[PDB]
Symmetry: D3
Amino acid sequence: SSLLEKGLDGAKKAVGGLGKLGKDAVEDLESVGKGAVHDVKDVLDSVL
Amino acid sequence: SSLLEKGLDGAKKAVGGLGKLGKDAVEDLESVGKGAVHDVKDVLDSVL
Amino acid sequence: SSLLEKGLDGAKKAVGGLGKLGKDAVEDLESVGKGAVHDVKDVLDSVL
Amino acid sequence: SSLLEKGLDGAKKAVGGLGKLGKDAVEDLESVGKGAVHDVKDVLDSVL
Amino acid sequence: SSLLEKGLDGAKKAVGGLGKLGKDAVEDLESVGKGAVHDVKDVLDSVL
Amino acid sequence: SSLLEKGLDGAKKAVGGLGKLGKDAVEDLESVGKGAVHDVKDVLDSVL
Ligand SMILES: [Zn+2]
Ligand SMILES: [Zn+2]
Ligand SMILES: [Zn+2]
Ligand SMILES: [Zn+2]
Ligand SMILES: [Zn+2]
Ligand SMILES: [Zn+2]
Ligand SMILES: [Zn+2]
Ligand SMILES: [Zn+2]
Ligand SMILES: [Zn+2]
Ligand SMILES: [Zn+2]
Ligand SMILES: [Zn+2]
Ligand SMILES: [Zn+2]
């Protein structure tokens, strides 16, 4: 079987993997930010 | 109503918006990369 | 290279773009609705 | 417990459910469109 | 047209459908869990 | 600050984390399945 299409599949899979890794990072930051805001609200609930 | 929780909502919404903007960017790149690989396969279909 | 597969790629990309545009719209409405409910809860926190 | 926050939760959950239903619809159409393009490519593979 | 690629498309579509069904299940559980935590917070708001 | 809401946040975050872990698993399997079908198509391209 062809090394050539095998190589483009290597590229394709790597691209997908990076998209996976990227999407995980963004969602992580989203939750990190909204979690910080929530934890802040908590301190201003037990005080005001 | 309180400026304070209003401000944390400002932060929360901004965080969500950035997560939206971020997720759009990643998905765009994913498709850009897999599209390039596909278009390359096309040239190596009409030739080999 | 073939206009034909080039055209089907035109269709494919347009379909993907619409799916992108569509998914953005739904998520926007989701957040719009849940944001309204949250802002309502806020008024019934500073009052009751 | 309060009927009021219970009601806003009713609204919130309904909004989420609609977002779910909506996202499912968009993704379905995405795949329907890209599937049609693929099946078309198949006929123009076994012929040209 | 070929039964063979027709069959692999059968497999592909079934795989996608399972991924759809799976993603729906996970998101459902996510919301079920976070909804339970929210409803619990409600009881400890009207009491403490 | 209250151990109680701190604990429910522990639960909430754990639930979200599981949803993350779950969604990653489903998407992984989706791609594993569609990748296998693609690699099979490749062998039936270089032969038939
Ligand atoms: Zn992570
Ligand atoms: Zn909290
Ligand atoms: Zn874009
Ligand atoms: Zn093409
Ligand atoms: Zn938007
Ligand atoms: Zn608020
Ligand atoms: Zn469906
Ligand atoms: Zn096919
Ligand atoms: Zn469901
Ligand atoms: Zn509630
Ligand atoms: Zn993984
Ligand atoms: Zn291949």
